[PDB]
Ligand binder design. Structure first.
Ligand SMILES: O=S1(=O)NCN(CCF)c2ccc(Cl)cc21
Ligand SMILES: O=S1(=O)NCN(CCF)c2ccc(Cl)cc21
Ligand SMILES: C=C(C)[C@H]1CN[C@H](C(=O)O)[C@H]1CC(=O)O
Ligand SMILES: C=C(C)[C@H]1CN[C@H](C(=O)O)[C@H]1CC(=O)O
Ligand SMILES: [Cl-]
Lengths: 253, 249
């Protein structure tokens, strides 16, 4: 029986809707749960899903200490992390990621109706505020970047004691819907959001290329097996079916 | 430290013979995306390397008796330390070697001539006048062979009919077939991109029908695999892989 650490994030992992109190794995549904089910069926393991106690994904502080799901793996409090956990340089040095089960890139979430069409449109002005979820991989992309425009955007994002950043995606979404604000957001989440709320749209294409992967502790004997199962699921068209299932939403033009 | 043996294969624009007016020797024989990648990896990780073309000139597939060939076999048998090529990360291969995380993303798509009303794989699957195929024994052909999706099973039935006459031995052959005859080639999207920049009568039809990547191959248990994965992620986040692709495409 593996311990799986995860985090609430639509539509990957959500509280199931019911009139009775829920317990254990039955508390949850979503893309990641469907994934975990397929993975257990292929590999034959049992699993206990547990929300990550500090409710974080995994980032470093000044002193080099980790938190979130990444920390859970490092400390062996979980065997797998199944969540939209972005595969990044800094994380991959401290955990063993499976190969990606989903591809994505950073893009822009914004309200419909405007001439804005790219990141460059934002970086070369100051009237439109823009930011990212604080300490997420998207923020780290801008902070570590040495590319001109992205350097400029980070300067603005982090200025004024980081007032342009948000603590979570929902806050970002509300901020886009209410004020003159664009959120730098992972493309898969933009796709999800813009098919439920027809007032929102993606601006431009992907500014980078990356994946979500299943996290395991360094040296874990499951990583390679999960990689192999993921490849099987992709080649069978199942990853694609799973995403169609959970991204369908309400439908927007 | 021991000079690493790197198996690879000629394929534009990943690995090509360098154009010079005099004979070439060693690594100097070669240029291309994968040579640039290799050189970036060696600088980050600090290894020396000798590039060696795979003797049988194959990527790596199994025969009836389940025996492997090509670069994959080279790695399995420890005749090479690394494989640096457009070697698709697949289920069957990952079971027998270790791949780094992908340095490039791609999917199967369609190479065809411009000006036609064909718009998707479906369009091809439901007809028989337009011939279509893939490189024999490549990961693309294997995808269709193993698919249980209705459209793709129908396509596999077509491709394998008539003793696989719809298949080609290599991408160059496929490309000429598309240019000359009424033929569509199922081809990796990255290669389509390269071809259509250079052949203005050709285009991609429809989107990607799957999603995968090229990765550096190492023998199972190699200590270079994770190191190379981390180096790849670093190159990616610094935008050098993007630069490298633009350079060669
Ligand atoms: O073959 S993989 O390592 N795992 C399966 N997927 C499909 C889900 F993303 C992808 C996608 C993109 C790239 Cl570059 C690589 C891969
Ligand atoms: O983090 S990775 O495994 N290796 C780095 N890259 C960049 C190579 F394109 C990508 C791209 C797409 C996906 Cl899904 C996954 C990855
Ligand atoms: C939803 C959140 C905060 C996560 C999801 N993947 C990124 C990560 O794994 O860091 C974060 C998003 C982002 O940074 O745009
Ligand atoms: C060019 C060739 C024959 C290779 C390249 N990658 C795939 C592989 O690694 O199998 C093959 C192409 C394909 O099957 O469309
Ligand atoms: Cl990996």
């Amino acid at each position: 029986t593996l311990i799986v650490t995860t985090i609430l994030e639509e539509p990957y992992v959500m509280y199931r809707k019911s009139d009775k109190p829920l317990y254990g794995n039955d508390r949850f549904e979503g893309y990641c749960l469907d994934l975990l089910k397929e993975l257990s069926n292929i590999l034959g393991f049992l699993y206990d899903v547990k929300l990550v106690p500090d409710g974080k994904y995994g980032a470093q502080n000044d002193k080099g200490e980790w938190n979130g799901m990444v920390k859970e793996l490092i400390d062996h409090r979980a065997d797998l992390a199944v969540a939209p956990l972005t595969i990044t340089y800094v994380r991959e040095k401290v955990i063993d990621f499976s190969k990606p089960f989903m591809t994505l890139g950073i893009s822009i979430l914004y309200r419909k109706g405007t001439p804005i069409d790219s990141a460059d449109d934002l970086a070369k002005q100051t009237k439109i505020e823009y930011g990212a979820v604080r300490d997420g991989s998207t923020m780290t992309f801008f902070k570590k970047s040495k590319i001109s425009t992205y350097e400029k955007m980070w300067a603005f994002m982090s200025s004024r004691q980081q007032s342009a950043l948000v603590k979570n995606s929902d806050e970002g979404i509300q901020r886009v819907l209410t004020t003159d604000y664009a959120l730098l957001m992972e493309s898969t989440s933009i796709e999800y959001v813009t098919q439920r709320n027809c007032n929102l749209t993606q601006i431009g294409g992907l500014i980078d290329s990356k994946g979500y992967g299943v996290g395991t502790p360094i040296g874990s004997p499951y990583r390679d097996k999960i990689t192999i199962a993921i490849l099987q699921l992709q080649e069978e068209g199942k990853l694609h079916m799973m995403k169609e299932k959970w991204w369908r939403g309400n439908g927007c033009p």
